[model samples]
Target: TDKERFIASLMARMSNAEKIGQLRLVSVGADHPKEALMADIRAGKVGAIFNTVTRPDIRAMQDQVRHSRLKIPLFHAYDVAHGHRTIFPISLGLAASWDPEVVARSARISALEASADGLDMSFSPMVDITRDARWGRVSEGFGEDTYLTSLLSGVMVRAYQGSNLAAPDSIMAAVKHFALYGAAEGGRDYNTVDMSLPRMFQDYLPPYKAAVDAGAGAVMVSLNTINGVPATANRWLLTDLLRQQWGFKGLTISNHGAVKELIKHGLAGNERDATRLAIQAGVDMNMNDDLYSTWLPKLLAAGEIDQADIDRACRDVLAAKYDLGLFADPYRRLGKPDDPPFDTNAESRLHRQAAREVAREGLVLLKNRDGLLPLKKQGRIAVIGPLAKSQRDVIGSWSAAGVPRQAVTVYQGLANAVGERATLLYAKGANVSGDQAILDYLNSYNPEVEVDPRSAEAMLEEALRTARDADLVVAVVGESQGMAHEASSRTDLRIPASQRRLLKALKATGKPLVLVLMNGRPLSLGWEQENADAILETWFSGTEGGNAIADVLFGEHNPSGKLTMSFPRSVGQVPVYYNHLNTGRPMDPGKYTSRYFDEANGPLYPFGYGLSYTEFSLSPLRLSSERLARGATLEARVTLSNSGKRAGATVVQLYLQDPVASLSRPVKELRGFRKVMLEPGESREIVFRLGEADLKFYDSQLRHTAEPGEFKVFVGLDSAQTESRSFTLL
Candidate 1:
């Protein structure tokens, strides 16, 4: 039934050194020179190579495998988070579409493009649920909701690994930063995490479990500490839970240099101890670290670690290779060596069309007070902002192989959307940030931001003049791509001081102000919400991001994207999200109520909230039964009617509330949803089926089962307002 016969046969012929070498997952960058790494590969002392995406370079390494004693082929992997070359919107932006199919299609294109560039696997589908806006990686995950992220994880895995793992167009999916990484203390990147077992099973563990059930080929353990122990060497996390409980037969790899960091975590005394701890704990491959190769041989020879441990780790690594069909044909995804190097722009025209369409679906209309959007194309429109002509920021962070020159800017998109019909004026209202320190720090990572030579006041005056002359002002504002990335956690979540000053000046012009917000994470937008006439959340869209914003502005595409994460009223409300527990006393009007005294008690915009050019109304919720039996399912139905004059789409969301359980439950949990499109005055029924599976929770003793209780069902467009009905479970 499998290739265990061939892998077992291959391993039997291997020596201790060869078997230990199979546990090596090396990086092809400066930490170890390419020539040195190549020599190790030839000596049969390396198993996998990453960060070497050049096709010929990879082929050269692949050829070197033939000269080794065993001739075991190597697999290439990279962080193909959103898109490979044709950068789609960031993972956070795509989540707003609320369509797993949309996310899967984007990943499918990412796999095809990444495979053509010599990659056999991708570290994608982060699936780490985050509620804190200060966490820079929020843009990399689905959102704060476990139910939503769980649905996305399976689809992303299926899309990346396609129907045939050995197919030339398919790249293996590697689910990453496993288990409670997103709950980092202080929203810092590599911080500590302390949580109860019940919350861990309920809130943090489902997405990873779903990915494993979806057959993810590999899992990258997080760099942070789960409790007091590093994830790289937490036996309970890697062995007891991941291997024994979940039965993830694939493999677990460490993030870059994370295995060796056990020394810094004070868990290991030396490099040898780090090596012993990590391998024994279930980490199969060590990435960008010399621990496995340097210390594994010594540890095994010294009888510090067992041969079975090394053998088990090596087999998992080899089995992953076998599954990708690399053992059958190493060059399955790599092209002929004689061909010209791949060009990102070759199929750009065709691919960007899909990119534009995909980007259009994820733009959330946050506020439109007077229908100022779908702007008429006959007047002078002033487009002013630091990001107006920015080609670099549009592609967003983790843009694997994306070329900045190919990205269409906000200024350019408006011009392309309305050719000669409208005169589009543009001005650099301000720099990305007023502080020079922030600029240089960001420039160190990506040097796209430049200081505008004009004085700040001079630029502000220019913006004011342009706004005065135009009938409407479209102010493009928000963070740069680098602002929301790994190791980029921020203490403040508001718009930059430079942009705020610019926005204030534009608001004074008395022209209709339309705020086009481009950012990776949810930002605090209280000021803009109260001042701007309209606001559109276009989250760091991809290559055609600018064009898509124009499409929505010109009435070509009705905005349907809803927020997956809530927008806090202030930075003080850092960890706000939907589906939270209702404490004995939740938010209320009383002083003693569970509320913030200094700021608003709730998020500015709730999850699943978005506006369209047209309007929609959901009929009162109705349940199929007043009493339900244990094994029987119940139907919750709602009549959705589009009451506006234009054709539009709406996502009908279903929230389930458990009033009574062994422990407290979330006030509302997303159990089911449907994305529907209707014509003017169209009406349709959306139905959701509920069973015992939907009501299960982890009890005090950690048993996974559902208890008899009263449940409430709420159905509507978003979480804030909905019609509810109650039913009893018998």
Candidate 2:
């Protein structure tokens, strides 16, 4: 109530230009000179400044903004994606853990480190549900399952905002790229999304709504077209759906220069039209673009938009600042002068320890045929390949403000794990890619891939020699971090040819090949699966990665992360997912089936699939009620045991399938999961309670409802190979 009253009073006194200014979120030292930006801050011609991470600079701008007639304090924000400092695993990896607490702890630490540098908001908790692994931003958001993404989305929003936004450790979370951004055509960023209403409502929109319901303070609109309209100007998607239906009261921000892109989308003829449509569609701020600041005032003077339009958006922006507690204490997050220097190298033992544990948990063991992992300490270990010691790729893309040199590489981790007990050898078998053009293009933006001066054969010979000498070869390989970042979509989701060549040679040497992958998206690893002795999907394990990898490799921890996104067997199965719809002739390979002649229909590794150092067995489902009435909870239980010699962890997944429905639903949707740890011979009963709400889905008319009918409940280790029982909702 106080936030509303304060915002109302502040808006009541604001002039048109000042109100329009509130709608423009500028970037620090990017679009304008420092001197000019300072003047705008004083004149109330700016709402918020981003990328100005330094405390002194942020404080200076906040102080300058106070001189404006309204005395509105400016908010500072940044893209503190995975970690602002003390980097944790990438967002995709976090989903792999299937533990909400892991996402919470990581976000909490990221907020603490980022807020100390005076960042009031984070453009994070990107909950856009993604199914296509070729999408480069698969690294930035949670994985494909809406239920899984929604679970973590709410946790992350609360983690960033905390119990009180005024707390020094708290930073306002902005759920970003909202409304089906991850489903871009061909898995390319900023492409059009041609999707159905049922698909959008049932699969895509829930995670964004979950964030808003969980009290996210801001939302960043996607840079895509929905129903032939750009999201920046899609009133039904933004205003109607987000505001009226979802009850989202938070501010809506544009993707960087998204408002300007409306013209390219053919929705807006010019800047004025773009500004008008974006604001009318409920976009509250223009991020890193001056469209709102320059055109809004002109639109008002031209009678194209009313002052109410400006006030509505301006109110949202001011409310965010107030919620950030900027109006109460502008310097709440800005540390005191006596505090330790707040630089990129900032370290918190508590934060690093959290990161270390979370990183270890996020690693998915894709394959371990003979239990070759948890290497013995007294052996000759060879850590080879391009990413064996790559500090940059280890921390991953969008690792905002994380110092690369501080990151631990797989080589370092293995070395640390061995110590004096074993001999560790290292070799650079290849660069990230053999294509120099791709390297040149990526490095132009940031120096990610550095070419080795040694000829290809020179590097290959050293790698072969090293592999021949070692007892086992640990090949640290995958995409360059840049390859899995924004605007880095790939046509081929496989190990780079250069690294594959090295692996082929290593495989021929008769050495046991253990592949440690460090990439954002799920790769097409059919060859790697057949050739390598073991494969670990360590998706950009951050700062403490090297140490964490060592922990998993040396038997200190068992790999438990399940596949959030399915690894396709071939690139032709690019869009394959666990919850895919069953075809009319689904997988009927006998004849005339919905199948590929060239390759298998299934992914290389199914969703919720992972191996443990130890083995596990799950009992059949036992339900409290075989038949249930509306509003009643159906309790289901399963006995799970660690049947192998080693103590380990695994995720028990619960999926529900509607044998028949008004709308054709996914084969099975993940309804719930539990990450359980047990010692050898340890057994526990896992229980899950499902109600009518969990059984509901959008019907033909886009209505959320659950029809009374038979349902099949499945419980097991993964999407495939589940034990099921039948039940009915009356």
Candidate 3:
């Protein structure tokens, strides 16, 4: 390839200083001035710059690089996590769709919008597999399942990178926080991880490997330590596993200031040692840290490291530039110098349409007793809550360059959905939280939250008075976006105490109560499950989130989104997931059972569980044969029907239980799934094919293979509510 040949030629002409300079990735922030950073760019001492997104700002930086000695172009990157200009639903919300293509389409639009803003790459597709709801960062990853995370990783990479990096709409995809960041101890951020080799390969490593295999252009090393060694300085993790084992030829970069934090990890004595260890361990670039720029030149002069190491790191960085076609056109993304900021509102109509559709599919209907939902448009609807008119929190955390003013609030969404057909009244039922400390912590990043000055009793009185006159009460309540984000892990998973008190008052009003939840992680809803007539889990839907919730609320769009992570009955049941290993004497009616003395033994709502306004019935599972030969395929079929009066969709979930194995296995692992839409009284046949590949697992010796044994296949609406059949693998 010309890219490879040109990079090799460029590397041959580079000096030690120039090569070392290519390993430096500096930070540019809106708060901090870029004047000092521009001087470094002009000196050819910086390779990449992030947090600079506007078209004019990026072009000015690249213009400075043009006058440098080597004229090596700079690649602009940012954490375009969910959406760039048009914010989509949070990553966890999109995962509930159970549709990888939906996730890919959202990423594709994000890349197009970002490229127009002069970005060359994105730190996206954060494909860590999250199991613990206590982890505030779970909102950024796919849920606890490995197969689903792996599938979405490939889909997002293909979408972000497109067919070629040279294309204008396409930006390079940087899969991030490599090597088990989600397994932080105590579900804490930047915490240590200690797991067995088999567990690492079998569970935590697949999504990252899958992203690399899908052709991610870069990988960001995790900030946490793995088995007592910092990921930034672990040779076995970065070289032996990432490069030698997985063959990832892309550039490897560190998390923000992670290379400098090596001293904090107690692994390095000084800045020089950190620089030497990180480079030798296979880190090609240092993000937001000047250790490489300050110490690498000295290290080379002192003969502490070889020139080959610097050359290898520089080549990877230059190769990435070449792949992005920077050599041919340094100003490819930045059009005319006077070009306006990308029309964030250009395709807003189309963008909001897709946002509404995706948001509609991502909502999970957790409970609907007595058919209370599908609220009629002719009644007086009381919309009350702290989040009813909250525009800031609706789009969720990590919303890149998203304006709170542009977001449609729950009050606005209901107004837009009902129009003149319904009289929509509103009241501030309660504040998100009355605690001052939580407000301070939430406002640290941005002024994302504000405390009302009204008394609690006054707010409750207004809510009660409004509910007394309304035909139905719609209560929108949950955690704010900042409360469920990184560095914001909570000890309790329940809704705020103030909101719960308001909910109890609403229940006392005796009006039909519909609870609309806006949050990131799975919250404990035991009280709502018992009191509310209906509950809809709307996980911080983006831009058109309010309109989308209205679409589902008015029966325009039936709720089909399923749960990817389980909802624990209490915070004591932390780390609860559907695919868990069965203990000896699993929960039973007899004594000495593995049951919690106070709470239930399992999740309140299991994974893959969701309800539609319409009803559905599944036929008995039918298999082609009871036995399977080696390397042969087995077919499982089911007849699905929408037995209600309206059209709806259902996610037909398939799970496999390894009843007997060399080692203990999860009770059932997700094998396959299909989401099918059918009209009233309509029936369709859904088929799934299983081969030996689906049954494979990492053994004690770490060999990836499957064993011939008895298995159980279960098919149903969710993990807990399913019908099973026996089969044998030979």
Candidate 4:
């Protein structure tokens, strides 16, 4: 309320120039140079700063704001996309865990580190529901599903901002790349986007709208052009949809250089025209875009952007700083000005442990045959392949504080796990690929080690020798994490030819093979499925990665984590998921499936599928009500027993399928789930309550309502199995 009053008062006193200046925000690096820029800041020529680092630099910039006629504190923001300084898996990778608690913890850690590093805000948990694997920013999103992504977006916001934004480590959470950065045409970085509002609300908007409803402090427009105009200058996407319809009161910032680059985007003639368009569209701040600084004053003098628009933008920008406690004590969190910010010990340990644990759980046991894992004592275990002894590629991309020297290599993990039990022999197989610089760049992130510039033949020959004398070979292989996150998505999700060639060579060894894959995102592994006796996907486990992976391989821990995203067999089936709308002619995989000519309809691994050391069987499903009214509850129960010799956890998934609907529905929608831990021979009946809420979806009108229909409830271990019962909705 006070902020509103203050903004109104300031707006009343603004000239066209001052007001237009408020609409223009520009970028400066972390090493922000020049204070005589004070004149520009005080005149409201600068609206925000991106990539600004360190407390003193920000504090000095904040001081410049005090001289502003309005005394508005400068907003300092950074791209804390993953873990700030403590990098965790990209949001998509985190989504695979399906643990909101983990997502929340990650955001909380990011907030602490970011605020400590002198940032007032972080532009992240990018909530775009992108399905295209080719979209470069897909890694920033929570996969293709809307429901799961929406849930996580809210979790991250709540975690970052907490109960109050004024808390010591709490920083404003900017729900970002707002409209559709993920739908860029051709997956190119700043391409055009096209979609209807109804489609947007049903799918894309849920996550961002959820963030807004959850009280996100700010919003960032996409770099992509929407329909025809750039999103940073699209009134329909910003003013009409975002503000008037959704009622998002937070400030709106343009993606890096988007406002000024509208000239290049062909939407505007020059900087002044671009500034006018973006401000009219409701972008309050510019990120790394020099247009706001270059043309705001010119536009004001020319009467292009009015005083009202400038004041409105300025108000939103200032409001966020006020919410962040910057106005109260601009330098409160910045300790002494001379103090260096990084506390490598505490944050590093907390983030790395969490990263490692999440990385460990993120590992999906794609396949295991004949108890091939839990390697027996006193065996000649051959840990072959390029990645086997690779300490370099252990941590996947967006890796914060995952130092390679400090990390445990796959060889080290096997040695520690199979100590005194199995004699481990190692081999450096084929390099990641033919690219030499790629190897050097990947290793550059950790410990700055030296890489061999040897030919491909030399590397493969060495790996063959190690396999020759071994009893069973654990041929570890996969793309390094850097291969997938942020500008690294692919149209072909195949394992590199270099690694696959090595695997093919190793497979010829006729030795029992175990494949341990370390990658950031899902990869094609059909060949491994046919040949390798056992396969595991360990996605960039952090510092303690080796120990955690060893725990699972040795049977000390029964892997129970389920997948949140689907793994397509090949890139041809680029966007496959569990809850997709069925077509009029659904595929019948039994005979002739109505599928793509290039590939099968199904994915390599279905969503929510993961195996444990022990087996679990779900008993016949039982429904409490054979018939139910529109708003009644339906209860069901199924008995689950470990039925095997070891203790393990099983995610009992409950899915509901609509045989018929006004519109086509998914084959099955996850309705309820329960994580049950059981010992050998243990049996317990698990119950689930399905209400009208569980059956609802956003209709064409965007109303959350469920239609009357017959529902098939199936209780199973994952999306694949079934134990069903029918119920009628009256």
Candidate 5:
């Protein structure tokens, strides 16, 4: 334990101000001058800095801290949400792939590239379990299943941190927005959340705990109020649940300006009270906020908090640095002058190739009626939409240092796919939307959306004229990057009105309409489902996105990705999910039940639903035992086969239902899944083993246990389409 001894020795020599400085995290943006931050760095007033990406900038900041008395190195953090330089698909798209090893590899590449730029940590692998598609941040999280979220959370943490955190290629992983930020009321960001303790422990807390158990070095507290208590000031949630119950000893930091927002939540009377509550509630670092430095000493002088509170927080921060090997060599990750000449546009064939393959696998083929996809090369194809030639929106949000001009557009992908065999026509069918409020909001931070000066009628006429001569109409349309990103929640989940009008006109052209979506979240496609002959949900495929989409469209790559979040028929079913609890009346058509008067009650596309070029069939579910006792293991087996012309991969999903438990449970919960690739006529037997552990659930008293009862097992391609059987637990 030389590491512990070294950290302890370093802490013992620190003065009170220096120790408090270790608990303060600052920020430097593109507009914020680095010259002004140098004094604070030398004075030991800042522990960490985010949004300072370049190697020269970070190295200069560290050089200033080195000349200080304490000489503690600064840890650089960034929101490497999806991929660092070589951008991959969004988090939801990665979840659709249902392949953890693939996700882990993507994270590994992101960490490597990010570390190469001298970043010490990433606030990523956002594992919030979101069921509401109206929540704009859902684009950054794994989908609604707790099992999938927890499974991927552990994988990403291990990938980002690696086995050796001290290695130059590794970066610290910080699991973010802890304790139910995803459950905000009305799917609004930073809104109040009120839920039962059992619900919290059962659903929301697993993913965060999974990251901690997998050795995440840091955690960012949520900005929301959980059950009338702000998470930054909730001692029971942060200390009792996170520390005492989960045994998480990682560094806990506030979200951006969250400590100061305690007053806005009505949880604190003033800045001094907010500082005392946040520190006592076990927050280790204050991010981009002045409350900690301004009020901490005053609160200490008033005896509101002791030195131990500051020291405990300071020790955690120092340990994170030591884990990152910063104490040994502060500039360990500083780029060498000759190492590929590090820059945002640095070329990496290996990284780009990985992104291309992963992006190809993340696309979900939602509709391919009459086998209209895999378009023939000897035809005139019309690729029309606002996003057809877009470069910046394809990389999506939180793109860490990725150059937008380098991104491949849909038109570029199609042209590359067709080469000289086909003539491709292009048109900017419509602007993303005509609403000034939405456009202004999207263009606030960055000009991702540009309004077209042409009239909507003229745009539609041009699109129809282009489609008149084409064999098929390929409409690349969806929300722009800013529309589906953080703080961009939508009240209506449909495509923009301008785009819908264009699609309707194109449908009247009598050509096969192919819809290629490029948004971040699940969009309601009720009209497109009826009008378009083919639909592909390509959720903002990254840097090589255009090439990847062309590959799938031209039969070079088979579409196999599945839906992790359900696509609602309308926004009224905003919270619809695969694992929802069964109502007392269920959806009985013959009696009073949960049914919509105008539309269907279920989702347009259920979770785990996706179409492939090849067909897959699952045999009847077979269980090893009809009855099981305590400590006994039961095995379920199903035969899966590729029954179509082309070779393809499919995810065989396993779901479990406890029909007669002491507490009510979801209709069915995802327990395990396996993705199997098969040849044209190949078949494989997939086995899933279950035990007492898999059957356990949080009860009314908040106790985790499994009861003796009848259990239903389902094996299928999706939540709705499945083969079912029964078993008894004794």
Candidate 6:
């Protein structure tokens, strides 16, 4: 009742023009709304805004908005995707941890700092199910699996919303890219999506629903054409599936320029028609698109669109402002020195440390032929490559205010842990990107971060010489942080050509090479996999990335992360993922089953494939209840023993398979997972309690159900190689 009264009071002062402006928040790159934009806000020509905040400017604007004809608090939004101030791992990299607690905590910290920066909302927790490796926005999402994305989406939503929606600091969580923006053809941004309904629920829609169920306050429709309809104009996607089926009560805003994309999609003659269709399709607000401000009023007068619809949308906008506690305290975000939301001091250090821990945890151990990794405490080691001493690489993509100086380079981390007893020689073998434009843009995010554009040959010669003098070579290489974030997608999932050539030269030295990879998306390292004695895939780990890398490198922390995203051998198989549909002509490994003429049948490295310092073996699968039914809990137990000498942690992944369903499902889906640590010779029976809920799948009608048929239960290291047993669901 208080929220309603507050919203009503806030909206009472708004003129029609102000209400329309409130619905269309523009995206301005200016750090704060300036006098030029203030002209519109003063005229009630703007209500919601994004990426405009400075301590003083935000406060002044709140006061200005309060004096307008219809006093309303503007929703200050920012792209606080991975982290705000204390840089955390990118969404996909953090999901590899498979720990919701970590995701939620990261969100909490992100919200805390974002609020300090005067942002009222964050366009984050991107729940798009990305299978296309080429889409640059893949870094914004939680990866290819719906189960994994759903878990983290709920975690982040709850974290941002917290327990209280009324807290001035508790900002609304905007669960985004409503439908499938990830199945972008050729992995391009704002590209077309063509996914079946069965595939939508089975692999794409779960994360958004999961966020709604987790109490997300709002959602932003994706900027893509789902199947044949644009998401912003697709009522089935925005209304039926989200509002009715999932019971999402929050406002639905269009992504940037989504309403205008109708022209691009060939669905409308111009912006006026596009604006009309979007409002009719259930988009509550137009984000950064002036379509509503320019056309909605005209359309309403002509009776093409209802005036009530415009008012209803305006009210939703006001309600969000009320929910944000902005009505009561318009200057709530104006940072105060005594009680600032952001810690200009040591709290940032803690954030970096956690980020580093997540960074280290994400280091996927792809190969270890003989006891090569967990480098002995004392040794003359050669740290060579573009990223070996790259403090800059720690601040990966979407890094907000993450200073590279705050990151302990891989060499510094190693030396700090092992001391002078370890002799380390460093070299910058090649630049992460030779493109000056890309590197310049990346440096713009953090002043402390920069790339050395030395000639590839000169850098390689120096690095090779250093490797020859050292007892062991730890070569670090991979994508630069900006190379995979937002608009940075890859056509080839390989280390940069310059770095690959550098690796070849260093590998020729006959030095025992331990390859450390820092990448955003999954990479295809066929040569590195086959040649290196040991390898670690460390996706951008945030500020504390180096410490986590060192911890895993020195055996202080055993590598436990499994690949959440699949690594394709090449980008040509762009949308490759573990849960891809089985083709009608299923390949038989034995009999040339759908063999490609040029490429290998299997992936360079499968999803869920990661090795640990210590070895683990799973016993035969066991299920307690053979006849499962509605609400039945199945006791599944698997015994894991650390078979290697070193103590380590292993990810015990459980997957579900439907021998038959209303439609053909993936061979298996990850149902549950547990990270367990054990000493040498320690054996434990890890048990998973599965119910009908775990077995539930979205039927054609979109009703979630556990269908009757043969179901296969799989238990193993990752999703690819596993031991399974079949049972009948009656």
- Count of clashes, each model: 0, 0, 0, 2, 0, 6
Per-model TM-score, in order, reads 0.98, 0.98, 0.98, 0.89, 0.98, 0.93
lDDT of 2 by residue, 1-730 (tens): 8777877877778778888888778875546888898998888888888888878788778879668887888888898999987889999988888888888889888898888778999988888888888898999888888898888999999999989988888999889887788898998888889888988888998888888889999998988887678888889988889889888888898998999888888887899898899888888989876988878777888899988888888888888887777887878877565766544454543377778999998998888877788888997888898998899888898888888887778888887778899999888999888898887877896677768888888999999999888898999898888999889999998899988999999999998999999899988898988889998889899989989989988889988988888878866777888887887887643768777787767888888999999999987779898899888899989999999999899999999999798877778889989999999999999999899998999887888999999998899999986558888999
lDDT of each: 0.89, 0.86, 0.88, 0.73, 0.88, 0.78
Clashes, model 6: 6
Which structure is stronger by lDDT: 3 or 4? Answer: 3
Off by over 4 Å in 3: 30-32, 337-350
lDDT of 4 by residue, 1-730 (tens): 7878866776678665565555555555342445545567876666667666666667777777767776656667777766765556556657766677877877888788778767778877788877666554665677766667888899999998899887868888888777777777766666778876556676677788889988998898877776677787788878888889889988887776777788888888777788788878888877655666667667767888786776677778668877888778877667765766564445343456665666555566888999877666577877766666666566555454334676677788878877787798776677666666666665665543334567777888887888888887887777766666565555567777878888888889888888887765567777787888898777655555677778888887777777766787877776677877767667754445457866556888887888888988877788998998876788898899998899987788788887776556678777667777799999999999988877766656667677787888988887876457889888
Candidate 5, 166-275: lDDT as tens digits: 99999999998787898888888888889998888888899998998999999999998888999999999888988899898889989988998998988888888999
Off by over 4 Å in 5: 29-32, 335-344, 348-350
The regions of model 6 sitting more than 4 angstroms off are 5-13, 27-33, 335-350, 433-454, 589-592, 699-704
Which of candidates 2 and 6 is the stronger one according to TM-score?
A: 2
Report the Cα lDDT for candidate 2.
0.86
The TM-score obtained by model 3 is: 0.98
Worst window of 10 by summed lDDT in candidate 3:
341-350
Query: Which structure is stronger by lDDT: 1 or 4?
Result: 1
- Model 5 TM-score, 2 decimals: 0.98
Q: Tens-digit lDDT track for model 3 on 520-633? A: 899998889888999999999998999999999999999999998899998888889888889888874756977778766789899888999999999999998999999899
